A paper describes a structure:
The crystal structures of two variants of Ec [name] were determined, in order to elucidate mutation-induced changes in the 3D protein structure. The crystal structure of Ec [name] [name] variant, which had lowered specific activity on DRP, and wild-type like activity on DR and acetaldehyde, was determined with and without the ligand, D-2-deoxyribose-5-phosphate (DRP). Diffraction resolutions for all three structures were high (1.5 to 1.9 Å) and the crystallographic R-factors were very low, indicative of high quality 3D structures in each case. In addition, in both [name] crystal structures, there are slight (about 0.2 to 0.4 Å) movements in the positions of altogether three active site loops containing residues G171, G204 and L20, respectively, when compared with the wild-type [name] crystal structure.
Deoxyribose-5-phosphate aldolases (DERAs) are acetaldehyde-dependent, Class I aldolases catalysing in nature a reversible aldol reaction between an acetaldehyde donor (C2 compound) and glyceraldehyde-3-phosphate acceptor (C3 compound, C3P) to generate deoxyribose-5-phosphate, DRP (C5 compound). These have revealed that despite of relatively low sequence identity, all [name] enzymes have the ubiquitous TIM (α/β)8-barrel fold where the catalytic amino acids as well as other amino acid residues around the active site seem to be relatively well conserved. The active site of [name] is located in a deep binding cleft, where the donor acetaldehyde binds to the bottom of the cleft and the acceptor glyceraldehyde-3-phosphate to the upper part, near the cleft entrance.
Residue numbers in the entry:
A (entry chain A): 1 to 250
B (entry chain B): 2 to 250
């Protein structure tokens, strides 16, 4: 028994087990659902494109794991600033049956000086999600924002507009989660005092058990070792699962 | 008989389609531009639901908001899970579809189950009608094969409220044929629903000469003025280039 084994099981149970690939199929999503039911316990969720939600729901139900949440993505991956498009996609994700929607913040608009559109877009999408008892995560795309001031500002605006989680990255740009970006976002959660109502999700590039342990260590430091539960912490990852299971002897 | 006259008619009745594994926003934007042809606009585009919002914006910004947006649900499998089909249909409506082409559960019908097809079409029609969205039903004539089954699937779809019956998904070995088209249009005529139910051949219709044959069937069964945009569509992609070529473009 090691800290690495303990952190690896913890991380596994916080995973949004993800496939968001150009060649995704029903068959691949079904296999992903089976993978989410691991020999050491269930992941917290899967994360898939909206069109796969109904077959995923059926698959999770039929294998006896209806408690595995179905997350999806909207305004994705580009984070455009057209609220009508973001909201139409979010309403469709809800209609497909999403439990959680991860919407991309309009980060290029923010970089260009538009703080208002990011607030309005997140608020509109939160309104739809809240009306359906769906949790809203907001992807701010730290690898494109780059500057600590912009990462803090995007996080702050998303929280003020009602984000239930803030998420680092889409996984569809070159640069995704870093420990530095993660720490900045979690410091915003702490500084605003919203740790009871806002979770954190690093996504993209988290591939090994040692990586997961490093990201969890930041949460334990800033909030206490009990804070990072499924309502407050998720890993957006895929190949990470095999690394965690290997660390656990499976 | 004139191929230029039939080609201009067919162009204006096209649901210009892309339903491909490599579809992207860029490809759908290009399709929207293609639908605004130098001899007039197609009736609609037909795309996967996730591209509806960007297509609507693209069509509006080029001044052709009258080009309708059709999409597909329960597609292409035609499975018999009504909850899944209805969820996808409701999502298509929420994306902004003008029209939903749902796949009939034809494998269930081939196994002897007529009721699931009725209930599935009816459930999707109820959602669409409440949203002022038109429902087409794909019966997959190339998998049904037998004339009696093609007639039965058409009849069930019409009785459950289809606004259009459509031959095919474009995703199986056999799609539209003139024989299947005639059988389906005969059902429309025989049930007396030619005022409320249109017909759409889809899949494999690639040449102006083929388009001419399908319109000739409609003209024979219903008269030459029946096939307008509310009662006739072509489900096709590369057909548009063949029609434009026949028209000198
Ligand atoms: Mg793709
Ligand atoms: Mg398939
Ligand atoms: Mg197992
Ligand atoms: Mg997209
Ligand atoms: Mg709140
Ligand atoms: Mg610092
Ligand atoms: Mg793109
Ligand atoms: Mg599908
Ligand atoms: Mg079934």
């Amino acid at each position: 028994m090691t800290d690495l084994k303990a952190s690896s099981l913890r991380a596994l149970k916080l995973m949004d087990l993800t496939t968001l690939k150009d060649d995704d199929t029903d068959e691949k999503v079904i296999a992903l659902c089976h993978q989410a039911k691991t020999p050491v316990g269930n992941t917290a969720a899967i994360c898939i494109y909206p069109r796969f939600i109904p077959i995923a729901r059926k698959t999770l139900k039929e294998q006896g794991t209806p408690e595995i949440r179905i997350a999806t993505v909207t305004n994705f991956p580009h984070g455009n600033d057209d609220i009508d498009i973001a909201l139409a996609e979010t309403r469709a994700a809800i209609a497909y049956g999403a439990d959680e929607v991860d919407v991309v913040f309009p980060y290029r608009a923010l970089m260009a000086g538009n703080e208002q559109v990011g607030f309005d877009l997140v608020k509109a999408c939160k309104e739809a999600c809240a009306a359906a008892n769906v949790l809203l995560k907001v992807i701010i795309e730290t690898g494109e924002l780059k500057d600590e001031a912009l990462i803090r500002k995007a996080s702050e605006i998303s929280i003020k507009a009602g984000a239930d989680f803030i998420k680092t990255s889409t996984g569809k740009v070159a640069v995704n989660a870093t420990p530095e970006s993660a720490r900045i976002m979690m410091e915003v959660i702490r500084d605003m005092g919203v740790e009871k109502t806002v979770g954190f999700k690093p996504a993209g590039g988290v591939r090994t058990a040692e990586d997961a342990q490093k990201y969890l260590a930041i949460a334990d430091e800033l909030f206490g070792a009990d804070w990072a539960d499924a309502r407050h912490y998720r890993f957006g990852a895929s190949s990470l699962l095999a690394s965690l299971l290997k660390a656990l002897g499976h």
